[model samples]
Target: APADKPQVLASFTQTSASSQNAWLAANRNQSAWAAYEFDWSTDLCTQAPDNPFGFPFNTACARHDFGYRNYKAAGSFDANKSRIDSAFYEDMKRVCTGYTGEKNTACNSTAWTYYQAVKIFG
Candidate 1:
């Protein structure tokens, strides 16, 4: 598919067995593939600034960029934003679990805020 749209990519329907196989692979793991894993360190933004305009360095932002870049490669970034958001939500919650009491609350708050910022501007 074109990625952003349900319709096929402009030349994708052409007679390419490899393309067909790739499509089949993509279809096979669609659900699990929806998840995003933020693997880079907090310093990723400080060192590389994942987004063009830049924002605070954080995992959610890194995951947002991960989703954007990965899906953009497939031609479907906008189409997959919500799935990325969901993954970010889960990821941030997991991050919050590492702290205790007020620190945990503060971490969770940053997670939510970061998720929102990425969704809005990423």
Candidate 2:
């Protein structure tokens, strides 16, 4: 693996919508990151609904999984867990942005619930 694997991971997990989309694109072509040896396996959203109330949160969950799995493997999970969870929340909120009014509120609420779950139990 590259010596900057952690830095690369941080770049992908940033709390901006652009970073989230960039991570999603990287996820689609994971072979490009083969040298990093990241653990891409995921039980997306775990027992939670992957798309609660029609908001698509699976991709965000997948990125959260990527962060958790790889950081754990690197023995740095504790140090980075909060930021990963926050990034997950931000990604889901970005998904919520596709809607308006009531639907938007619902999506944001669901995102908050998912974020709280990970913050407390992840």
Candidate 3:
């Protein structure tokens, strides 16, 4: 890995839609980042549902994977874990925004649950 790997990881794991989108694009076409040698492996949300109640959280989970795997590889998982988990929460909340009323509430609730789980056990 390069000396700038930490900065690159921060850029992708930010709590913003643009960062999320960029991460997704890179995740989809990982060959473009072959020089970076990122670990693109994922079990996607682990034992949790990738799309609980039909709210598509797979991408959020993937970003979480990117953060966890690479940061751990770089020996900085503990330092970055909080931010990465928050980013995942934000990503899931963004997904929840696509709905309204009770559905939105439910989605946000589920997102919170996922975030808390990761914070405690991830």
TM-score of 1: 0.51
lDDT of 3: 0.87
lDDT for model 2 comes to: 0.86
lDDT of each: 0.50, 0.86, 0.87
Candidate 1 local lDDT, 98-122, one digit each (tens): 6788777776666666667656766
- Ranked by lDDT, top first: 3, 2, 1
- Residue 22 lDDT (model 3): 87
Better of 1 and 3 by TM-score: 3
Which model scores highest in lDDT? 3
Determine the C-alpha RMSD for candidate 2 after optimal superposition of all C-alphas: 1.6
lDDT of 2 by residue, 46-103 (tens): 6764554767787889999988998899899999999889999988888899999999
Per-residue lDDT over 1-122 for candidate 3, one digit per residue giving the tens place of the 0 to 100 score:
67887777788989888999889888889898888899999877767735547778888888999899999998998998999999999999999999999999999988988998898878
Error of 1 at 36 (Å): 17
TM-score of each predicted structure versus truth: 0.51, 0.91, 0.91
